[PDB]
């Protein structure tokens with residue numbers, strides 16, 4: 001090691017507010033070492049020095065690695081004072097060599113540092129759809145006899161806004177998205193025109209303020225149903241206004257802008273019958289007629305969701321309802337009670353769906369009934385510790401049900417694998433005992 005560090009200037013210019021908070025940046029010093037790079041001999045660190053001028057060095061400091069000069073303390077000093085802070089830049093070679101340099105740090109009278117009209121700007125909210133160059137709000141700061149250069153210091157990472165550094169007006173730069181970020185807090189600074197030209201920023205309570213930008217959510221996403229295609233079934237004996245299925249649409253918008261009204265569009269049915277109705281807000285479809293002798297019939301309609309309660313955007317799904325009776329059904333006897341099965345149906349059904357689907361693409365299991373396990377003497381009597389669960393499946397290909405006996409194969413075939421998947425719903429030693437044909441059928 002045999003070069004010292006050498007400051008870029010011997011004397012450095014700096015300014016500081018008379019009240020400045022501890023850690024307020026005044027300026028940066030810089031030194032180079034001609035010893036070989038990536039080496040303790042070319043490794044430059046910065047201290048201060050108390051020898052020549054001690055008071056300056058009590059109240060000020062230099063960030064050891066960066067060379068940023070900062071206030072060491074909340075200070076209270078008289079305007080037009082001039083501190084002489086001597087910083088030393090030193091090696092880390094053997095032996096250590098160093099170099100000093102001075103920073104003439106001038107204290108301002110408060111009237112030379114601009115004061116913003118307010119400490120925090122909370123402009124009205126901004127449409128996420130607002131066009132580029134849309135005015136968000138306006139900063140303003142003054143200070144006698146000198147004109148102002150406005151700027152964003154921090155918080156505009158994503159380059160979402162810009163500022164007319166002349167008028168103090170803030171505008172949309174890139175487009176916006178409430179689905180990404182709802183809020184912004186910009187830090188704005190106002191330095192004076194002379195002082196930008198010298199390249200000394202003088203941060204203070206006075207000449208920094210914050211801007212609080214709130215993005216207004218807009219109805220920019222349309223409803224999307226859980227499923228493009230819904231598949232249900234009715235029994236021939238379904239009572240008027242029987243539950244058939246519950247549709248649901250969703251929307252990345254918040255509030256009223258994601259709140260659905262539901263309506264159907266059935267192709268005309270004879271004798272001016274509606275066939276089916278939906279509840280406008282629950283999205284629950286029901287039976288609006290009887291289906292006597294209509295087995296292997298089917299109905300294809302479509303359902304609409306419109307958000308903002310039918311004032312907004314819309315999306316659609318297609319629905320299929322197939323007619324059936326006991327001929328299409330199988331019974332699933334489980335060693336657990338009906339209240340348990342019924343409680344967990346959406347999930348159990350969803351399992352059976354997965355198993356039937358590997359045979360029949362897009363098949364849908366449908367749940368005619370759940371009750372006590374019928375047993376004994378021509379199924380006369382019932383056991384409420386076990387459960388008869390009555391099901392059927394619907395092929396979207398055919399629109400008609402699946403063969404009772406095919407349904408049996410698909411399930412009895414995979415009953416070991418199903419009973420594993422049921423384990424969590426049914427509990428320890430819970431399982432499907434058998435699958436059987438409805439008691440009515442057998443002739």
Ligand SMILES: *[C@@H]1O[C@H](CO)[C@@H](O[C@@H]2O[C@H](CO)[C@@H](O)[C@H](O)[C@H]2NC(C)=O)[C@H](O)[C@H]1NC(C)=O
Nearest residue numbers: 148149150151152163164165166167193196197
């Ligand atoms: C302050 O405002 C002006 C714009 O009103 C900026 O000046 C432009 O700067 C760009 C980018 O450096 C140059 O390419 C243009 O030639 C300038 N044009 C005009 C018409 O001014 C200026 O850079 C802004 N910022 C600062 C800190 O001064």
Ligand SMILES: *[C@@H]1O[C@H](CO)[C@@H](O[C@@H]2O[C@H](CO)[C@@H](O)[C@H](O)[C@H]2NC(C)=O)[C@H](O)[C@H]1NC(C)=O
Nearest residue numbers: 254255256257258259260261307308309310311
């Ligand atoms: C969201 O929609 C609802 C229902 O259509 C609106 O609520 C009604 O507002 C009127 C008058 O503005 C009142 O008379 C009712 O008391 C309100 N009813 C309900 C159920 O809230 C609601 O204003 C809408 N919300 C927004 C944020 O626009």
Ligand SMILES: *[C@H]1O[C@H](CO)[C@@H](O)[C@H](O)[C@@H]1O
Nearest residue numbers: 088090096097098099100
């Ligand atoms: C710079 O600091 C170093 C510390 O080792 C001294 O060697 C030098 O005389 C000067 O004070």
Ligand SMILES: *[C@H]1O[C@H](CO)[C@@H](O)[C@H](O)[C@@H]1O
Nearest residue numbers: 049051052086098099100
């Ligand atoms: C500049 O002056 C200081 C004393 O403040 C020394 O430590 C440094 O080495 C250089 O002489």
Ligand SMILES: *[C@H]1O[C@H](CO)[C@@H](O)[C@H](O)[C@@H]1O
Nearest residue numbers: 010011052086100101102
């Ligand atoms: C900066 O300049 C001062 C005098 O203005 C010196 O005392 C100091 O050591 C440094 O060179």
Ligand SMILES: [Ca+2]
Nearest residue numbers: 003033035041
């Ligand atoms: Ca060196």
Ligand SMILES: [Ca+2]
Nearest residue numbers: 177178179220
């Ligand atoms: Ca958006």
Ligand SMILES: [Ca+2]
Nearest residue numbers: 217218220253
């Ligand atoms: Ca939105």
Ligand SMILES: [Ca+2]
Nearest residue numbers: 221251253257
């Ligand atoms: Ca929406």
